[PDB]
Amino acid sequence: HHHSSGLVPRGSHMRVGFIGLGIMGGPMATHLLKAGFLAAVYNRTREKTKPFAEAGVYVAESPADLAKRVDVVIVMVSDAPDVEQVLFGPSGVVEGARPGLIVVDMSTNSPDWARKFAERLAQYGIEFLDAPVTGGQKGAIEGTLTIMVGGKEELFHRLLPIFKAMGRDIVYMGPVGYGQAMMLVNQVVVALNTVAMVEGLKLAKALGLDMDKVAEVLTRGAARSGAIELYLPKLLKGDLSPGFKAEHLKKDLGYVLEEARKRGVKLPGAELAYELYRKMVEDGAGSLGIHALGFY
Template identity: 35%
Template sequence: MTLKIGIVGLGIMGRGMAANFLKHGFTVYVWNRTRAAADHLVDQGAILMASPKDVALHADVIFEVTANDESSRAVCTSPDGILAGADPKKICIASATLSVRWIDELVALCFHKKLQFCDIPLTGGRVGAETGTLTLLCGGDSAIVENLQPVFDAISKKVYYFGPAGKGMRYKLILNFMQALHIVGFGAAMKMAKAHHMDLKKVADALVERPGGVITKIARDRYFNDADPITFSIEWIVKDLTYAKQYIADLDAPLLDDVLKIYNDALSSGNGHKDWASVNRIEV
């Protein structure tokens, strides 16, 4: 039997995931706070529901793909939320990037209601969502994750399993910190090159060619050209780094503090809507 899919939250990631599930022949139930985001998917065959609860009542696997803790809590725990419509046969999946505090609370809520739950945040951005080549970062029961592979095949190229529910989100926060650190470091490298009158394009291209240059390529491309559409905003990385700081509150992590300050300064300057790789951008 082909599992029926639910998508709650139709931003960049949710829209792309829903479209790929439809292309692979899944029945897809969707909900979004604003209906307009669902119109194109409905034209492709998605079924628009009145509430997250209704999505959970009809779908077998429900992906929650919202913006932050507040929106996730609202669509999960309200009287018309996912948990109100789910039963122990359903699989609930949190795919937004959320705080450890909230994901652990959500794990406990699902355990109390005897619901199957996985945290599976995503990486791959807009392109990955649209082309079905996301990387999935899984936490949850290993048997559930294994059984969901036919579902994952419609939206991803790689699946990593990190352990019990909550571990996927912890890894995602680690990953986003590392990537933000890399992007900020690229900006510092360009300043060094400029101070010594070097050809910035040559320096940037050489940095990309070194081992591990994938994130450097993103940073280079966004330093020399405006991002349109953006891959990931300054506002979003501030949210994720803030969650990461909460996650390691008892540890000494000066690099995280420094990177978060740089992005917070950019946010405070009215640049939250800009691509995260534009931080520290220099004139070239």
């Protein structure tokens, strides 16, 4: 069936549907709405679609109902199995998309998963990019995300206006899976920079140092990091909320270690970080921010 007009003209070929209105997806979709690209949203939990319905965005009943109404589907759900459900489940994107739709997975998973999604979607004549992001919840809210993209270079270029609504530095990394590969590199660094912060704070509190001065010194050379700038003021206030959930970093480190074993590289720091965050999930703190490691 054909459908009535929505917020974004059909002739633009740039109607976006957004799936996953979480800590990152809510602000990212709001940015696409401010820029005039957002036509529709889907969220598993309906209440989070409310603020978008109040601004006239269509709230779909399923990923398939969303895909039939848009040119570009952006997915920002938790993990690879979640992406599988929203693309390939009974009422997934592939059950409503027309050939020529583009799926952009902006969640974090792995190069292998990106290539699998692309291969499966190409059976339906659906295009795919992996475009994971860094900059945290603050970057999402401010629209300043760094977005790292794998797929057809032509499609990177066609979607650049959509990526610039959500982010600032938009980097084309290479073929499918190269955005996830860059993200796995990024998440090695983020995890170990976060363990750096939490161990420095544990030592500073054991030494009885003035936290005002500890924050002053650390917020500078070359101890200073993104993880300190984004999270040390929440940590010092005892605000353990995400931020970035510990269960999601555990997931990212699992993919890092799988890729390192495939390639014959030993990453003992990433292995330790995985163990630490695995324990944090087993202890029941998987939904706290990664900065609560050591303090939960």
